[PDB]
Amino acid sequence: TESIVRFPNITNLCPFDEVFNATRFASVYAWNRKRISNCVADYSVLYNFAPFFTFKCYGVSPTKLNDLCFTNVYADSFVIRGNEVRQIAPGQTGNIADYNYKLPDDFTGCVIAWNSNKLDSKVSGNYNYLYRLFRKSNLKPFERDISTEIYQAGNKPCNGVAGFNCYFPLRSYGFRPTYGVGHQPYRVVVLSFELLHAPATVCGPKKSTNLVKNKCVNFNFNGLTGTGVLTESNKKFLPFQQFGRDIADTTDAVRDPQTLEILDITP
Ligand SMILES: *[C@@H]1O[C@H](CO)[C@@H](O)[C@H](O)[C@H]1NC(C)=O
Ligand SMILES: *[C@@H]1O[C@H](CO)[C@@H](O)[C@H](O)[C@H]1NC(C)=O
C-alpha cells in the first residue's frame, strides 16, 4: 500500500549554467573535465541554454535522467567543426577518437551539440581548433595529451620545426563567418554518468518519504525499483559497501542514504 522513496538528503543546485553558457569552451585536444557532484540535477530545464541539440543518449533515456541517482557526472565541452558529431560515438574512430576525445568501448552517457555558424566563428576564425592530427599511440578512453610532437613516421630521426619529413601536428581550422557549410563549428558538450559505486552524490528531484520496517512497500532506494518487505539487518556491512546482493542478480539488502541503517529486502 506504500510507495516510499528514499532519495538522499541534499538540496544543492548543479553547476550546469557555469558549463553550458560560458564564453569560450576549450580546444578539442585539451578539454576540461568538469566534475558535477553533491547537487540536485533537474534535467527538464536544459532546453533553454543551448537548443537545437541531438542528445544521442547511449544509455539512460532522454526523459529518465530525473528518475535515478548518479554517483559522478562529468561534462567535457570542446569544439569540433561539423564532421565528427556522429563520429564521437563509441563505434566510430579515426582522427577524432584515436588522436582526440575517445569514448570507451562501452559507455553510458549522452552528448549535446549545437551550431556555431556566427557565435563562435569569428573573423578569420578564432584559431582555437587545435587537434593532434597524428601521434604514435591511439588514445585510451577519456585521455588527453598536453604535448607537442615532431612526428616523422621514421626516416633520419628529426626534431626540427621543418614541415618536410618532420611533420608538425596540432593544426587548426579558422575562417570568415561564411564558408562551404561543412566547416562551420559545433559546440559539443558530453555528459558521462556512473552508477553503483560510492554513496550517490547527484540525485535529481527529491521525493523522500519516511520508513516503515515491518511491512511490504514499493520501495525506491536511489533510483532502483523494488517490491517487497523491509526490515532491520544483522549483517556486517563495511562502511564503503552500498548494496547487498545474493546468489542471483537481485538485491536483498541495501543501505539508506540517511541514518546509515542496513536494511534487508525480502519479497
Ligand atoms: C549567459 O550569460 C549571460 C550573461 O553573461 C546572459 O545574458 C545569458 O542569458 C546567459 N545564457 C544562458 C543562461 O543561456
Ligand atoms: C537528512 O534527513 C534527516 C531527517 O529528515 C535530516 O535531519 C538530516 O539533516 C539528514 N540526514 C543526515 C544523516 O544528515
Numbering used by the authors: 323 to 589
Task: Give me lines lifted from the publication on this model.
Owing to multiple mutations to the spike protein, including in the receptor-binding domain (RBD) and N-terminal domain, Omicron BA.1 infection can result in substantial NAb evasion. The Omicron variants that have emerged more recently contain similar RBD sequences to BA.2, with the addition of L452 and F486 substitutions—L452Q in BA.2.12.1, L452M in BA.2.13 and L452R/F486V in BA.4 and BA.5—and exhibit a transmission advantage over BA. We expressed and purified the prefusion-stabilized trimeric ectodomains of BA.1, BA.2, BA.3, BA.2.12.1, BA.2.13 and BA.4/BA.5 spike (S-trimer). We determined the cryo-electron microscopy (cryo-EM) structures of these S-trimers at overall resolutions of 3.1–3.5 Å.
Group D antibodies were most affected by the G446S mutation in BA.1, BA.1.1 and BA.3; these NAbs therefore show higher potency against BA.2.
